[PDB]
Design an enzyme around this catalytic site. Structure first.
Site, PDB file in Angstrom:
ATOM      1  N   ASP A 157       8.380  13.233  63.588  1.00 36.76           N
ATOM      2  CA  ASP A 157       8.356  13.065  62.150  1.00 36.76           C
ATOM      3  C   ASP A 157       7.914  14.382  61.503  1.00 36.76           C
ATOM      4  OD1 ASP A 157       8.528  12.107  59.615  1.00 36.76           O
ATOM      5  OD2 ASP A 157       7.184  10.385  59.858  1.00 36.76           O
ATOM      6  N   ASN A 182       3.832  16.044  56.694  1.00 38.73           N
ATOM      7  CA  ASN A 182       3.100  15.925  57.956  1.00 38.73           C
ATOM      8  C   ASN A 182       2.565  17.264  58.493  1.00 38.73           C
ATOM      9  OD1 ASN A 182       5.204  13.125  58.829  1.00 38.73           O
ATOM     10  ND2 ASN A 182       3.084  13.141  58.114  1.00 38.73           N
ATOM     11  N   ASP A 240      -0.361  14.772  63.132  1.00 43.22           N
ATOM     12  CA  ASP A 240       0.143  13.433  63.456  1.00 43.22           C
ATOM     13  C   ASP A 240       1.372  13.441  64.362  1.00 43.22           C
ATOM     14  OD1 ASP A 240      -2.009  12.359  62.137  1.00 43.22           O
ATOM     15  OD2 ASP A 240      -0.990  12.144  60.243  1.00 43.22           O
TER      16      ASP A 240
END
Ligand SMILES: Cc1c(-c2nc3c(-c4ccc5c(c4)CCC[C@H]5NC(=O)c4nc(C(C)(C)C)no4)ccnc3[nH]2)cnn1C1CCOCC1
Length: 265
Positions: free
Chosen positions: A127, A132, A145
């Site tokens: 992702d 992020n 993350d």
């Protein structure tokens, strides 16, 4: 691996995401930390806990560091390095910074170093996107993350036709067949460079998710942000080859970005 939650002092709310609220706080009265308070029902917790042992060992200057977890009671906590300037996406959007193009390319380099390290450990982010990544008080960008997407319980996030799925960061083989690989992270990284040079515009801002999937399957691509040089655009475009095996590696992207820094100092 385990942190005693009683060693935490909570100080400020940072925001709310896929797993609930995230807070800023101190560990043992002294050390800045971010604390994810994992909302019940939102994570595959046992799987994540087994995986956190592996993630603890991923250490790189450009990767947000996982410090430990608090598993004894729920909500469980994920404790991480704290980044004073928040997410890269909102940072790009604050026009007051008036970044120079050399600073924009340094941000891409920061991310590309982190990803090259992850690629060297055969660990997918899944992702990768400006939302992020995070920025520390020195303006250094780090990747956050990585791999946590595997533990999300929400079908709107996981399904490729879901409302929360990162359609605009995904390659055609991901949208068509869920073929995930180092090359899907590469594709996302090129979209991320585009975000950076576009100062946080939404990729394909005039299309819906559905429209985006259809257009990229037909071969449409994002186009050059005004702040990107031809050489920089070349690097980002290279991430978008229709054939996954023709996209570069992060090691190759890194040398490309270093060369461009040398040529446009
Ligand atoms: C936000 C902020 C920070 C600041 N945030 C942080 C965070 C952090 C990380 C993620 C998130 C937040 C905060 C929050 C929400 C999103 C959330 N995403 C997830 O939890 C999440 N996604 C996922 C998948 C879907 C990719 C799998 N997994 O987990 C961590 C460390 N250091 C920080 N520093 C500093 N200042 N500010 C403003 C800046 C100006 O306004 C005040 C606060």
């Amino acid at each position: 691996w385990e942190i005693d939650p009683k060693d935490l002092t909570f100080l400020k709310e940072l925001g709310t995401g896929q797993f609930g609220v995230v807070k800023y706080g101190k560990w043992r009265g002294q050390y800045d930390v971010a604390i994810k308070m994992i909302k019940e029902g939102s994570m595959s917790e046992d799987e994540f806990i087994e995986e956190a042992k592996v993630m603890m060992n991923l250490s790189h200057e450009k990767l947000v560091q996982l410090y430990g977890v608090c598993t004894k009671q729920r909500p469980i906590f994920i404790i991480t390095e704290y980044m004073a300037n928040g997410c890269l996406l909102n940072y790009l959007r604050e026009m007051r910074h008036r970044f120079q193009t050399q600073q924009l390319l340094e941000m891409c380099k920061d991310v590309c170093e982190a990803m090259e390290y992850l690629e060297s450990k055969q660990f997918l982010h899944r992702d990768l996107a400006a939302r992020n990544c995070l920025v520390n008080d020195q303006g250094v960008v780090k990747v956050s993350d990585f791999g946590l997407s595997r533990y999300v319980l929400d079908d709107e996030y996981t399904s490729s036709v879901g409302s929360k799925f990162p359609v605009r960061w995904s390659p055609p083989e991901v949208l068509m067949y869920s073929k995930f690989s180092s090359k899907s992270d590469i594709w996302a990284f090129g979209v991320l460079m585009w975000e950076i040079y576009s100062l946080g515009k939404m990729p394909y801002e005039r299309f819906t998710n559905s429209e985006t999937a259809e257009h990229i399957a037909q071969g449409l691509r994002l186009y050059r942000p005004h702040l990107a040089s031809e050489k920089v655009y070349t690097i980002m475009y290279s991430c978008w080859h229709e054939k996954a095996d023709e996209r570069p590696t992060f090691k190759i992207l890194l040398s490309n970005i270093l060369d461009v820094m040398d040529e446009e100092s």
